[PDB]
Amino acid sequence: NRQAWIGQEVLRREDRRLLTGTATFAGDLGVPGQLHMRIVRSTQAHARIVSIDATEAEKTPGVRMVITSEHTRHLGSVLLEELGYHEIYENIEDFSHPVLAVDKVLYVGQPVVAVLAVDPYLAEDAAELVSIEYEPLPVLLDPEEALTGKVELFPGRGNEGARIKKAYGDIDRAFAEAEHVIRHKYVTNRHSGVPMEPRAVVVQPDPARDTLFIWGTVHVHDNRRIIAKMLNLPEVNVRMKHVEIGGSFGVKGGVFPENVVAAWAARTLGVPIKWTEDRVEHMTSTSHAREMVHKLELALDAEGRILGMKDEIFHNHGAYFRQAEPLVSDITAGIVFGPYRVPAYDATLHAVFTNKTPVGAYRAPGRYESTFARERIFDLACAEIGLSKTEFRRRNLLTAEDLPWTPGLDIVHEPYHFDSGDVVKHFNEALEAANFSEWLEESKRLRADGRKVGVGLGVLMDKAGLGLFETGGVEVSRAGRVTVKTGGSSVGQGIETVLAQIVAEELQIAPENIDIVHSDTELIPDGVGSWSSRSTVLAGGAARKAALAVVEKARRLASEMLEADPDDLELTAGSFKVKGTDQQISLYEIAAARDPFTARADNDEPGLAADAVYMNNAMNYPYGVTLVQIELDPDTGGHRILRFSTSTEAGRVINPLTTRGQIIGAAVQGIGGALYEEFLYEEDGQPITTSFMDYLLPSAQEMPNVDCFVTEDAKSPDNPFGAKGLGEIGIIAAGAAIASAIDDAIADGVHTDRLPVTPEQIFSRCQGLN
Amino acid sequence: NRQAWIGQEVLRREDRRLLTGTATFAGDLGVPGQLHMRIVRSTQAHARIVSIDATEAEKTPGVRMVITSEHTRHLGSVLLEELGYHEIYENIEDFSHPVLAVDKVLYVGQPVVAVLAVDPYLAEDAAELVSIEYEPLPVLLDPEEALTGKVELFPGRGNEGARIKKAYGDIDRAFAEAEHVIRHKYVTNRHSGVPMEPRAVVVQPDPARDTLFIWGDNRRIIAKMLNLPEVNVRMKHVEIGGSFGVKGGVFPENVVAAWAARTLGVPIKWTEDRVEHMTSTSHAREMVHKLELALDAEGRILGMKDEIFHNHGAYFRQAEPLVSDITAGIVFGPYRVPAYDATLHAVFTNKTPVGAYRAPGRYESTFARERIFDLACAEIGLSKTEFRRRNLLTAEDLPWTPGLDIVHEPYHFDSGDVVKHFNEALEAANFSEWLEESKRLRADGRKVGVGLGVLMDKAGLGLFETGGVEVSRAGRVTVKTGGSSVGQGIETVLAQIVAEELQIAPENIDIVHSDTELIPDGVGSWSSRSTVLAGGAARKAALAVVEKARRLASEMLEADPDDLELTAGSFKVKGTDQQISLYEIAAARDPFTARADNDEPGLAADAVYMNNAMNYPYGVTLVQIELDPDTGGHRILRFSTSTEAGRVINPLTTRGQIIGAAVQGIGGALYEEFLYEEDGQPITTSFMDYLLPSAQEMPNVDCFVTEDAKSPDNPFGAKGLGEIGIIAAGAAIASAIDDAIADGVHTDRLPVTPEQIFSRCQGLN
Amino acid sequence: MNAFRLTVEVNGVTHATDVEPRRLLADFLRDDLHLRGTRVGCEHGVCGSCTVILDGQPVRSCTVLAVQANNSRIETVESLQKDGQLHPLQRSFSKCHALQCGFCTSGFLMTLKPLYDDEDVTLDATSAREAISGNLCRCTGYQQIVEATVDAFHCRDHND
Amino acid sequence: MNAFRLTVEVNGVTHATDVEPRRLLADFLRDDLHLRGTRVGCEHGVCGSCTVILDGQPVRSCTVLAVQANNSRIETVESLQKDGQLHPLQRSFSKCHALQCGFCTSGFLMTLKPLYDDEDVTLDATSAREAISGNLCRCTGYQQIVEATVDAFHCRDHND
């Protein structure tokens, strides 16, 4: 019996917690003697202040204290972000406010003053009574007029952002010797993750001062490292506790001003502090994303093959870096080329500042915005060259042949180098088999008195190792069960299930008996976290050589327990059959026997100096094509997405049932970005989309009756097991394909630039009939 | 250079927590949604039952549930003792409740039924309304009557304990080959610790497919009984206010809480009533000693002998019968003892189950000996003092691997007295003695007495004790230990040990313990153990970090070198031109490919472990009482206990332990006894009946008298000290009293009541 | 100045407690009736999680002051499970991976509950979508939920 | 069964709360006032830890119903330290190692407090013992406590 578990559809381990409601979330936590923090936020977009009136706030009963800026610029550093630095140069700042500075305000929703009261009702009751008089300054909003820079945000100025540049060989000759040279600029919409759980933090101090407990949800819960350094009380003593999270999409990823204010205030009062975000707040305070300006250029010959490709990008970072370091901007500038033959290139990314909510990293950050413009310049190019988008992408995709194809673009640091180590294979048979699966041609064939069709491709910077390591640990027990410690984090995508399978496979124990513990920094003093579709080959790779450390620790230890040497039958139950077929020793009894007999019955080998797990220089790049067909009502602005199918090649799907969730779910978040979601600021500076009535989240009825999934496990990469990151591959080309279809269905020019596609824009067909 | 921390009077670290009110105790803990547990305890010393199901308890609004034996008996099974020797007979029998009885009841105080309410007031409110039907049964109380039929506690075959014997040499031919042979039967008290904090437990479940959080390393049992591991612990740190070995390990209350917290997903809190404590928790001290002693015309020992009956109370908690095994081993103390027969009975009666009170079995045995000695010094007339001077140790004949079945304490293997010379202690520890003698100047002052104490401190313990050292960023070091802070200033002793080896002020060391998530494995703090053990861990770890630094901080700069000047907190290189700090090394090496510290004790082949550590401390106690012949009150005019012990890590806190321990013993000598009426009902249940010593009665005087002689063979050669203060406080007082009448050393039954000091005019007649 | 005494039935257990009028039902059902099962995402009758059974009708625990619920039956997600066995709706939701994060699970489940318990109707993919539409999710999106609900209604009725 | 409205000034801070009459002051001070500094050992005015300053006079917080403290000033061991500094008594208690567990520390310290603050008397070893005698300890043997109190009174008066 060699029961296999990886690749199998097994129902999630997380399911029952969430279904019954036994699972606790950050907002669910209660601690006796709690104080409830409410935050007085900005009402100006750009303003310096004189704030001294919390008098009637301080004097309403039930309120224990009101925290001003002067409390917190103290010690009271300003929000550091970490490695990925060089640095070039420099950093400060942003970081955010970073904590309430008693001088200037750089966006509506910025923390200025925190109150502390007994119940959250009384907390904001006192928050109203706080008065701050403002000097309104001029307001910056357009990324392009940020750097043509009058109206400077920082008085030190403090050039807006960081300028990233990457460019191969001889693009001067690649362009100069081209027949069709194509220039167009694209604009992406400002939108984010907007998960269902708003941000929430609970801090309990151990006033014995020794320590501090944080049931806050800080999204690398092993980034106590920041709070520690900031508060100067490091590094244990800041012991983080595990909580379930209601979705993040990287939008919650990192340290916020709220996190430190609470932690500081908790420490210096010896009193537990609780914080729970407004949705409204979330819309003006939680990290933004997606807003770019994509000037692009192409070099093409009479064949239609690529020769040269690129110009400048303007990433609008909002007002501040927020562990939203060039990281994403650096990634974006690395992969606006995707999985194509691109002889040369010229990135000049301008990460810039405006009076908006500080930009973090939304699901597939910088790659939704880039694979849009890239596929919106390719579609446009087919208009002049004259012939099909299908057979353009078809023969200048990614020659292989070529593979390994060390590019092709830069000067390749994505995010460091060198890459693209595209050792993973056949670029094309995906697109080929993806349309041989099976329609596309079948309703390009349309009697089409309705409307039309679209395409788009997405490669992914999706195992950001991180580099070198990731920790893991497996433990067998006296009670039948198995325990797995990991540096992973259940944002709700099924890590605790995937790892259980990985361990199940290697240990020959049902994934039911295995439990997984994460984000509890007392058990797990070191872990990396969960971002950039990574946690399987990294943390699952940790789980493997952990479970593989026990099998030796056990099988070796079992040969000593009976007297048979390490050869037997073949050895799994999980237990130990020597011979064929006398006797046996179970895997748990082995562990139960290693008690206080001079020892210990467990493993945790990742890692040491010269790390473990080892994933270094080159990450895997998964690639995928999205296929869409839309109908449109022209007398109004309506549309009904008739068909949808994202198909992505990624070696070794670990859990097919759950990966389907990660593909479909993401794809919808893409349609949300493509046709519904935009943060609208009024020309003076105030946010307009603050409620849910304004910001449009896709609902059940409007979505495609099915997103089809075409994944194949050809060409496993060489990081055993040969698997890929898949938690982002849904949204990548969701924007471009929708756009192409809309332009194909009208039909004028293939000339759409700005997302989203509002119903007002989409009667420019009233023009067509006129 | 640099300065020294070890052996220096350093103000302890625990102080500030306790002084200010930041310090958390299990009872101080509150958790939202809490259920307050009140336990309905036994009111019969011995009976079978026909319980109600209230109903009238469960009916009272605010009552969520009532736990009977129905729930807890399936399961977990009976409480589970400990390692792992002693499994040579087969109990249960006992353990304790276990966990709730619906068959027989075996002592007033035994948990029968637990209620669960919203506040603790409604708990006791409804617990009253529970009615239990009883059928009384013949009540056992006397240890001797216990073993000779006719009444039984475990009505099967059991039936009344364990028999522990130890012998070698020829006892009888030594008894035949002797002029003077001495016999007497001594009877000892029933005390316990009775600390100022009563027992308290809080349990928080993570009801989502997970764990339990517990506040109050023997997780191991609860985990097993609930079949909840792999732990899944999760024992959390709380400061404790006095164990004295009374709070021991696992109680019935401990496991009921966990069960109920688990099967409900509701926070459960329990805090003990004082009346409960005096009837529920570890009793001790109750022993009978038959003693035979053989002597030549010179008066040296040729052999000891006879029976001991330990009244274990109703069940086997911890000790198990570790205490009863130990006692039968060291009734001979520090002496030339050629051979003896030592036979011990661990017996049961309808009383609160026995645990390991400070120096368990040592107060008891040390009485019987230094009283069978004063009696030989009466019957041969030879001087009480120089008897011991003639007849303690073998100055030259060391190592002294003892005669009889020894060491076997508790087991494997050896042993013997290699700790320093005995007498020049007794000799040198007589500052003030012989002029304390000059009495009466015919008066009413009367008393002078002596007592002697070996201690199986050490009790390896053992084999190991985990430790760990972390240096990082902000100028502080964090030390994790398997030990427990109970009040002895363990967090300080380690702070010194580490500070010395690390070249950094102890004001910068913080100590973490008893957080089982952080500390996956460890032993506790028992029989005067941890300073050698858990300190030897802290050394081993702090000795590892220095090699991590002074060899991989060699590469951070140039060169190997490798160098002069090892540390002043940092490392000035090859001369006094500048250096890398020790925190700066740690600050550098965290995301860069590795982590910047050490938890070297230990690996698959163990560490730190000081292995069966012998390490026997020793000393004298010197007592001068005044008596008031009618009233029979007394004023201890002078008191001085003596101790030779290894290195003595901290003189200030060691003084506290010694002085503190004595007062507990003096309390046992003249104040404390658990009293019972004929029907088995406990009498001394409040504080007015059980008399703890107070400020006025105790000697303004206690002379610290410690000597650093030959260190043992366990690094920086140290000894266990937290139990030697008490040892002889029994024997010395009694001999002092009998010298104080006089009519000669004929007192047995402790304590010494003033009614007993009504030999007043039975001295005149 | 003004306290109000609630007499409410929640998941069977009746409660009597004094609450200030302005506390919303959602906050009341989480404190101190520690039934964290009900979850709060939006703040104005949109997110869905909010949703609870009030007197048989699904309403938002978030647009109702706790005080308005006096003398009424209330049921939350905690009330589905009956002795270990997950209510079939919960089973098919796991059988079809109808949930990844957890938030949009009280909301949908409680919306679907009275619809389930009443003998009609069938729920086909089209009519299934319309049913759940009152609840938002940012993870699935719905495809599997729609697939999950349907499955639940087949083992319900035609059922071998 | 009808709660009483209590008004008490604790450590300068005023409070207004309904309590049921039967609640002991000790339990009131610990809950919900969340000053765990006051500790409870015996249950009948013996242990000492119990002890608190009531209206300037040290009394047992455990032989007094909370309701009996209405419109009165109460001080606990929490009120000693002012602005990071430990009050002289606490400082000397550490200087002489006058504590080991922690329990018999609120009790003694609060008993000694008004005695300290008032200009008389000296406290010599004999008169020192009689002062603390109202409090029990099972760890120190009082010897060091008696030594600790004396030290506190020398830096107090004859100060250099």
Ligand SMILES: Nc1ccn([C@@H]2O[C@H](COP(=O)(O)OP(=O)(O)OC[C@H]3Oc4nc5nc(N)nc(O)c5nc4C(S)=C3S)[C@@H](O)[C@H]2O)c(=O)n1
């Ligand atoms: N059942 C699964 C789950 C994940 N994977 C893949 O294996 C890795 C393990 O996941 P992880 O490393 O956590 O991926 P990320 O750290 O990038 O996070 C998951 C991904 O997809 C997500 N899915 C989410 N789903 C829910 N319900 N809620 C969120 O907040 C989520 N947030 C995210 C975010 S953020 C991203 S970017 C990922 O590469 C993923 O593509 C898989 O093969 N099978």
Ligand SMILES: Nc1ccn([C@@H]2O[C@H](COP(=O)(O)OP(=O)(O)OC[C@H]3Oc4nc5nc(N)nc(O)c5nc4C(S)=C3S)[C@@H](O)[C@H]2O)c(=O)n1
């Ligand atoms: N400042 C100190 C403290 C202890 N030691 C010695 O070094 C060892 C470290 O202490 P530990 O290992 O805890 O010794 P025990 O486990 O035997 O506990 C200490 C001892 O003495 C005690 N002292 C106590 N003091 C207080 N205030 N409260 C308790 O509950 C105490 N409980 C005990 C108990 S139990 C005993 S038996 C002990 O052998 C002790 O003798 C030392 O040299 N210097």
Ligand code: FES
């Ligand atoms: S928050 Fe109340 S309904 Fe969405």
Ligand code: FES
């Ligand atoms: S809401 Fe995040 S998983 Fe459905």
Ligand code: FES
């Ligand atoms: S316990 Fe209340 S007075 Fe001692």
Ligand code: FES
């Ligand atoms: S240390 Fe336990 S009472 Fe003083």
Ligand SMILES: [Mo]
């Ligand atoms: Mo992400």
Ligand SMILES: [Mo]
């Ligand atoms: Mo002890």
